């Protein structure tokens, strides 16, 4: 069955992000569309490390849950960002460290939070947004990346972390891990002069 | 058999711990409450990463040692947290790179060490107060925290480490995760102008 | 069969990589020689910790694929290193945190990127040059690859990271390693007053 | 047989330092004492990661290599710490980062190359004195620590790393990661006002 291998697939990348520090705790959630629309959703207060395939969340469009453990409340901003972008097919939310150690920062630009210096980011993903400051939960999350989900993949609540999309499971965690990494990069280069890809440099990435 | 079982989460979620590098050789130790009230601790002299779980410790509420292998000299105090807090149903005890770090610095806050830019360690534990160095095995590390036991549930020992608890060994594993975790964004963004939360941001988590 | 052995062995050491960090998501590539002169390479978007080994790519030394999934767009500059040293048996290719960090900073020695304070690197591959900035998959990447690989084992591609080679496959995981490790003692070093090993402990080593 | 569980302890231990980013590459070698008072020794070449218990090294406390694959070159000084400090029954060498880094240092203490602010060091290990730096495989390399073995059971080879030695490979290891560890916090505290153990809590570990 599709359905299975899907299950098992996310219960695979999950304990992936467990194993290697990307996911800390019960901090994080990941779900994917399954073929017939409905969403495939980590549950809530669930290790990703040791997650049971047959009881990740099943939830339809409008937000039914339908089977599996009670999901997580992040599924909330995930459902909106499948209603506003017809290309996401799977959303990763994990609070790894250092794409949640730059959403601390004050004087971030909200518009996108790292200056390239590496070519990576800027052709999976592009522009990466800075989502405000709200209480975990707060309608407002949910409402913001509803706003930027049509023309962004990627995304940075401030306080909070990284929020990725992809057209794949594979692609939103291979795209988490590359911003996850060029944070990383930003405090490991610190005060060194960097350099940055220039404009012309960047435009040939765009395309 | 719910114990057996109990002794394979703790042999599993200490095996965790050393894997991705939360436990350093024999440094630590994880104890959990058995339904009957009995304790479960991880023996002394042992490396989390390869447990025994027939050879798991169990000690009285009284600290009479009952069963398996002599239980690490650092039982002495969660006894002490759970003598004076009925809601405490694991105590994890590590020496975590950060959060050992952390401990030794001067000039800490005695009542809360860290303040608070993410705010999932005040949701989850609240205040870290901060317990005096003393030689290892001293009673006035018990002493302390059973003190510190009634209000509080993670704490930090001064040039020592962390000492977290839960009302489950996976609740206190997560909780013991987020501190680390906290405590490594402060040395990552260092001088850095960090956006902290403000008074009345903290107030809507402490709900 | 030898052949499959060797593709084992690359699943094997590419798995390695991943789950140890040194690989981030499909970023990255791995070939060797098989003794008919043909190449084993990792297939283009493939992670390299769930890598099948008899889907692992099959070119020959003209760049004619073979059989397997489609290469990796990086095997063009894999090519290159083959057909100007003979000594070249395998190729490394990954975005390793600290040297892709190196190969950010304005100001390197584009004949050796790192100044010797540990004799390992300096007896394994020697001189490090950098190769400069191109956008991935350019022509001059390969080009300048092929200009340099006669008498260099290592490259530092700039705003990208690090290309090794060696003679076997275990032999340029361990060159990639030791240099990953020494631009981490870099940043780790910092503005330190570190003890560089003096011109006279460089040729003892060259032997 | 005592001998089959010792080399697969040796195995098991040594893989763990691989996964865990102790060891990195081929930089590394580890030793045990059998009871017959012969060596026990990873071979030369060997990848910590994947060893083969059975082709293990076993050299005789006269350096007679009789069994197994080659034994390291580092097996050289590994005698020399046996053949003078009868309590020493395993010795492991690694070029861990920050114990490497540290060891990179200028105007380090030749007697003990850390100042303690944690007590666990102190009280395993005691002094840390610096070796000095040789040519790998130097005849003076063995030579020094064998005039620091009676009275010393770890070391720091500058530009080189830590070895470090126990009454047994658990021991030894266990040592060697606390090493680690506190040169780990060295890096990490960095100039900030640390609160070092005083004179009187540091005599009270040496009991």
Partial sequence: KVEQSLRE????????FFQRGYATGSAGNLSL??????????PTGSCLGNLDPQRLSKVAADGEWLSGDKPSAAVLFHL????????????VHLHSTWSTALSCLQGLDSSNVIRPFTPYVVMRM?????????????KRIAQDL???????????????GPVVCGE????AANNMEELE??????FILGDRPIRYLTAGEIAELRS
């Avoid at 569309?33 to 980590?42: E, I, S, V």
């Avoid at 794949?168 to 692609?171: D, I």
């Fill in 146 to 160: 509803a706003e930027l989900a049509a023309d962004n993949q990627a995304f940075l609540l401030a306080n909070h």
């Fill in 181 to 186: 990494e060029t944070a990383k990069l930003i």
């Fill in 168 to 171: 794949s499971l594979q692609e």
């Fill in 126 to 138: 592009g522009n990466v947004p800075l989502v405000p400051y709200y209480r975990p939960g707060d």
């Fill in 9 to 16: 697939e996310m219960t695979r990348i999950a304990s992936s």
């Fill in 33 to 42: 569309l399954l073929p017939d629309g409905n969403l495939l959703a980590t």
């Fill in 80 to 91: 909106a960002l499948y209603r506003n972008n017809p290309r996401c097919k799977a959303v």
